[PDB]
A paper describes a structure:
Unexpectedly, a monomeric peptide with the same motif, Met-Ala-Met-Met-βAla-Arg-Arg-Arg-Arg-Ala (referred to as MMβA-mono), also inhibited the cytotoxicity of Stx1a and Stx2a with greater potency against Stx2a (relative IC50 = 59 and 9.6 µM, respectively). The binding site of MMβA-mono to the A-subunit was determined by X-ray crystallography using a co-crystal of MMβA-mono and the Stx2a holotoxin, which is a subtype that is most closely associated with the severity of the infection. The co-crystal was obtained by the soaking method. Diffraction to 1.6 Å-resolution showed that MMβA-mono was bound tightly to the catalytic A-subunit through electrostatic interactions of the Arg-cluster with Asp94 and Glu167 of the A-subunit and with Asp70 of the B-subunit, residues that are all present in the catalytic cavity. MMβA-mono occupied a wide region of the cavity, including Tyr77, Val78, Asp94, Ser112, Tyr114, Thr115, Glu167, Thr199, and Asp70. Also, Glu167 and Arg170, both of which are known to be essential for catalytic activity, were found to interact with Arg at position 8 of MMβA-mono. The replacement of each Arg of MMβA-mono with Ala resulted in a marked reduction in A-subunit binding. Replacement of both Arg residues with Ala at positions 8 and 9 abolished binding, indicating that these two Args are synergistically involved in the binding. The C-terminal Ala of MMβA-mono is present in the bottom of the catalytic pocket of the A-subunit; therefore, MMβA-tet cannot bind to the A-subunit because each C-terminal Ala of the motif (Met-Ala-Met-Met-βAla-Arg-Arg-Arg-Arg-Ala-) is connected to the core structure through a spacer. The structural information that defines the unique binding characteristics of MMβA-mono to Stx will be important in determining pharmacophores for the design of more precise and effective small-molecule inhibitors against Stxs.
Shiga toxin (Stx) is a major virulence factor of enterohemorrhagic Escherichia coli, which causes bloody diarrhea, hemorrhagic colitis, and sometimes fatal systemic complications, such as acute encephalopathy and hemolytic-uremic syndrome. Stx consists of a catalytic A-subunit and a B-subunit pentamer. The catalytic A-subunit is an RNA N-glycosidase that cleaves a specific adenine from 28S ribosomal RNA to inhibit eukaryotic protein synthesis. The B-subunit pentamer is responsible for high-affinity binding of Stx to the functional cell surface receptor, Gb3 (Galα-Galβ-Glcβ-ceramide).
Numbering used by the authors:
A (entry chain G): 6 to 10
B (entry chain A): 1 to 241, 257 to 297
C (entry chain D), D (entry chain C), G (entry chain F): 1 to 70
E (entry chain E), F (entry chain B): 1 to 69
Write the structure that this text describes.
Amino acid sequence: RRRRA
Amino acid sequence: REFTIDFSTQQSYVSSLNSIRTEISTPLEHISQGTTSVSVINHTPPGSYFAVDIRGLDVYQARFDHLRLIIEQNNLYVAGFVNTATNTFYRFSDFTHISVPGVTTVSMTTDSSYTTLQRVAALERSGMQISRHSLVSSYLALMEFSGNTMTRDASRAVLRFVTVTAEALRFRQIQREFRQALSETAPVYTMTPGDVDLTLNWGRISNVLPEYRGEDGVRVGRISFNNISAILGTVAVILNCQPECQITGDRPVIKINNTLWESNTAAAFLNRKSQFLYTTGK
Amino acid sequence: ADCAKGKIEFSKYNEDDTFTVKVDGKEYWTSRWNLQPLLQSAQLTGMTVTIKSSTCESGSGFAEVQFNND
Amino acid sequence: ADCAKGKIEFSKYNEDDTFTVKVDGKEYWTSRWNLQPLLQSAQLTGMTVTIKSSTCESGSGFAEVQFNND
Amino acid sequence: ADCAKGKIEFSKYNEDDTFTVKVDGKEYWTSRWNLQPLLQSAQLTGMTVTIKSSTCESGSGFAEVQFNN
Amino acid sequence: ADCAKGKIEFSKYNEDDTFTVKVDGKEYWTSRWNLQPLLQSAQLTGMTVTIKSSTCESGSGFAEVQFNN
Amino acid sequence: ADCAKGKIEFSKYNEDDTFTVKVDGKEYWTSRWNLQPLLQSAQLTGMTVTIKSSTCESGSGFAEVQFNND
């Protein structure tokens, strides 16, 4: 999973 | 719980962040000086959040005061934003498990990934500028926002506000670099590639630092700390090691020549075969 | 086409000596020998990889890949 | 068949240049040269691997292995 | 001369058997397979690389590069 | 025979393209090139290596070695 | 002879496919390709290396190098 804000 | 982040001065801003950190996290025994530490987020059940009221965009004035951020407590992700004038919670698509009582919840089509937000914003974080003026503009964009799908200007606003709230909570380096923009000089903070790399390595750092026992340095991917003051000047709050703690394998660290390495990093440059055989074997 | 952009969910060395990665829920194989350690390093470090190929169905082959830090 | 899934308990370079790993209490050898560094790094980091072969008794050969993120 | 100095932003292997790295906002490529593990290792460990060439130019090939921690 | 078991005290690339390791006070060399990265990795990460060979006198060759974390 | 002992200050891939390292203030190059990733690993991890050669002038060649940990 790519980085979440 | 609800906290305020007050942007009036550097003092008010740092004091706000320190209060949040004290309430939601506990210092590491081996990375703590005085009351300044690398702290681990206290366990909370999944879906627990805290609210952050934004204040002080106009220094010490009770205006621009209708924006609240909803932050998932275990991972410090911004789940969305609340317009307190309209009592409306705009919630990113990856946070349907976060329920806020008493508000109208607008479930958005947009997810909170930096990839999505940067695309919709047409704004890359590396080189992104943040000033007091652009935070006022961001505030106004979020108060004007309506609907279920993020707009360009709302996405730019979220990029700026997440950087100076949640990412600053995580990283004392970002707190230190950004806070200069709050001074009377009103300079501009420019987010650097190194700032961005820190945010992208937060989970990996979180898995490594609980193992630190005074080694001469720490190496996590592209991130290097050469002493305890580098650690403390850079990192403030880490995950409780959550899925972001592990990429693959089950070994947090390897100690090599009195440096604590993320095991995955060492494995990723030690998996080469003989160079002559690699290059001739086309 | 940009077929997939994501983290490597697993990798596999195949009996025909090609190498498979699963990205975005789809499996892609490559016969490029140079890529085997590079793809494992990406998996180990959680790199985002972009698989580029003329067909994007699971089971397609590729020879072009980008390695990102984000 | 999927013969063994788990961490590598030891690895061994053999005099005939094959390479042995012990997984789930059973030893398996491979003649695939490229698997030697890939398996050692998997071993180093505690990566879960799945050995795939026609026979699964300890002492069997393999030419296929999956590197998992478990 | 020194064409570019910095950390590697991304790398890419291309269908034409070239290997691209982006350094300080500019893309450079090499066809030396020796450099693929060296550059990717530099990328994932955050080394500072200095691309050197006879004729520095964006989108141009290289085969001299310094590596610094 | 288990010639030596322990940590690699040093490794050395030799002018004849062989590779030497010192284990448990004794030096051994191998001509197998793929053992060069495997042994250096073992040295860097603190693996216990078991050198196995027909002859185990100091300065002898080997081509079988076990690696343990 | 032992030309230089210390940590690698920098390494450099050269256009003729040789590889240079700077150790204790002196530069040495090697044409042995196998040494390229090994020296890189040594540089990354702070190994103490000993350059060995019959000519020890800076800018000279080498093909023997010892690797030591702390």
